[model samples]
Target: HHHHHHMVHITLDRNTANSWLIISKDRRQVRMGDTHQNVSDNKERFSNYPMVLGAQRFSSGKMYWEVDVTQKEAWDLGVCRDSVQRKGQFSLSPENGFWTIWLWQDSYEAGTSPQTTLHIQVPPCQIGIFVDYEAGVVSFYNITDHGSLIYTFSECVFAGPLRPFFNVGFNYSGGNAAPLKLCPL
Candidate 1:
């Protein structure tokens, strides 16, 4: 997509990360750890999920960012409302303040009210996320496949600021243990 001008840098927000998420020192990568980290209990920290938010926040403009999810078997990547509830189990859906597409085992799905399964030919090593706040749209692209469209959340109702969201997912006996790296612009 000729939207390079809209590219924005995104870093992991440690304070908003779950206890099981291990954020890199540079804040550009995150991985799921087996043991819970000794992080403080706060409203910003996610209590149940192995997730994290980006430090950047968006209000009413277009922005793009990419994540290197190579070798990951289970992971969630997208954007969510800045005020999304973090302490409980919530379905990943637009109705629950999230717009995301994820890989579960060998299946790909979008975080719609009722999750939508995706039929993709080639899995991407890196995924590009683009958001148009005013248009209420969030699109995911398979960068490894010449930027093919993967999924799009349309007609979303965004409120307040939005942050890049991630779920490192389960460690499954060290099977899906690779970190999700944020790509440099």
Candidate 2:
């Protein structure tokens, strides 16, 4: 028998963001702009979506990453297939090659087809997303003293390389002031 645990560092690929989103200098923090920018769009850019993706693609290894979501009113975080449509109006569900945990309206939920609403005494300011390809699992953790288990998507037969996905919710609900930051390795 053998057991292995590891994690990797990732930088945000700024070019993948929509015009209304802002990527920090270090390329690890993203937030929605109060006013849209003139960032002429492209195929890789998310049209009408407040999203950004990490640069690297991971096809193997169990990994973990954290995001500081404090003060954010709404957002989404998880792993997505590399080739998933980065364009307009797409469902972020497993059937659509996306498995994400959403933070909205003071509550947490996994974006499954039927959707799984999570129960927590208090929303987590920090979130941990874990991916175990071999085990076919995508787990979300609420980072706190007690480390609450938020939700886990099991039996995920990944179709291709998975990338870290982040999106500040639509219409700057709380994105202008609160940026989604990737925790340092």
CA lDDT, every prediction?
0.90, 0.82
| Top-TM-score structure, candidate number | 1
Please report, as a residue range, the 10-residue window in candidate 2 with the lowest summed lDDT. 1-10
Error of 2 at 183 (Å): 1.3
Model 2, residue 108: distance off in Å is 1.2
- Tens digits of per-residue lDDT for model 1, 1-185: 77667999898899999888889899999988778888777889988878999999899889999999999889989999998998988899888899999999799999997889997899899999999999999999988889889988888898779999999888765789999999998
Number of clashes recorded per candidate: 0, 0
C-alpha lDDT of candidate 2 relative to the true structure: 0.82
User: What TM-score number comes out for model 1?
Assistant: 0.96
Off by over 4 Å in 2: 1-5, 171-176
> What are the clashing pairs of model 2?
none
Question: After superposition, which runs of candidate 1 have C-alpha atoms over 4 Å from their true positions?
Answer: none
